[PDB]
């Protein structure tokens, strides 16, 4: 019936990616899902699925599919996974304990690091309390350690975000990685995205 392709090509090959705290969420519905483009190793540094095996995605059907895009440090890729405890997982992008989907990452030393410093990517390191899964805090409000109206340039009034600063010649884990998280939903609704 439906002969439409999904825009997976325009999510992975997107020209520019957002910061993790402002992570993008794109809906996928009413197409056919060709995952063959993902089984290209030596491109994707990490490709790990939870609740499904990556090798049998083309046989399945879902209510909607969600694609999350953001950039994190290489050492921070490890905590984009259920039940992790780092800064990014606690304050920037939380996955459910019962997460059903795939996490894909690939190195972007080429396109997101410069000899001068690429500080255009930010992350939140200060927050009153952790994020529920799939929450997204986009606020930039001065942070006081004891929860009070905080009006800098006063004391104990602090800013919640921090720039990564990616460099071309630095450690492997200090290099920037681009991440796409695929989420599969399976509601009481008919499945609109299926394989060939």
């Amino acid at each position: 019936n439906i002969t439409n392709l999904c825009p997976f090509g325009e999510v992975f090959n997107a020209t520019k990616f957002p910061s993790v705290y402002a992570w993008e969420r794109k809906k996928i519905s009413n197409c056919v899902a060709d995952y063959s483009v993902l089984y290209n190793s030596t491109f994707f540094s990490t490709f790990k699925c939870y609740g499904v095996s990556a090798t049998k995605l083309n046989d399945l059907c879902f209510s909607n599919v969600y694609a999350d895009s953001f950039v994190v440090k290489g050492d921070d890729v490890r905590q984009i996974a259920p039940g992790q405890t780092g800064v990014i997982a606690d304050y920037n992008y939380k996955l459910p304990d019962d997460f059903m989907g795939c996490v894909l990452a690939w190195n972007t030393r080429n396109i997101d690091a410069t000899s001068t410093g690429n500080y255009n990517y930010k992350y939140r390191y200060l927050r009153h309390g952790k994020l529920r899964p799939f929450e997204r805090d986009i606020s930039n409000v001065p942070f006081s350690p004891d929860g009070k109206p905080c009006t800098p340039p006063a004391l104990n009034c602090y800013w919640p975000l921090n720039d990564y600063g990616f460099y071309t010649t630095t450690g492997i884990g200090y290099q920037p990685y681009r991440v796409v998280v695929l989420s599969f939903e399976l509601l009481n609704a008919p499945a609109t995205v299926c394989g060939p």
Partner: antibody
Amino acid sequence: EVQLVESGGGVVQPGGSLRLSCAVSGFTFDDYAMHWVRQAPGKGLDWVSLISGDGSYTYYADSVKGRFTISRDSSKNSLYLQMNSLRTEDTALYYCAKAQTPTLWWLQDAFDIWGQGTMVTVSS
Amino acid sequence: DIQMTQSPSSLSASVGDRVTITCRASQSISNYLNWYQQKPGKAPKLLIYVASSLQSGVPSRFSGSGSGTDFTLTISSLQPEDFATYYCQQSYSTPFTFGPGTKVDIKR
């Protein structure tokens, strides 16, 4: 067609409690996040609270947090808003609103169907 | 909270006119702005859903555009049933916030 019938409203003392109800029809209730939007007499639209399809996720506006509680009943295809510690500023017409996209997520959506309103008037 | 403003607060036009209403956010809300219409004494009806997408049943004359912080709602040929108040709403983050509304009334 989708119907959002609302009931519960009335006149209540400051400090009193009040529970609101919204009985739905015309769509698979559990697939859509539900919302409450209130409108004070002569003023604009003010969002109040949301609940996901599961009921696993709920979020409240700062003005009502700590005293309003939102819930849904799958078997009764109904949405509820328990209001406690009411105060005159809460006096508004309360709409029951449906997210158009059938998702277990709550953001980046619109409100495609609105019920007609139940009036809450907090005065002594 | 993200602050939604709308310009102008009031607008007077006639049937057949082209009407253009501005809505602006204090923050990037990407494309997640919705446009609603409310006639006096009745519930809001949804008109535009992701800054540009037209809701089923809404007449073709309505259209929206914009991304980031600047958004616009346009009616190409005004109609007698189009005289109402128009609100914009961001869905990028909770709590959701509405614009103050723009009232469109009959020129006289």
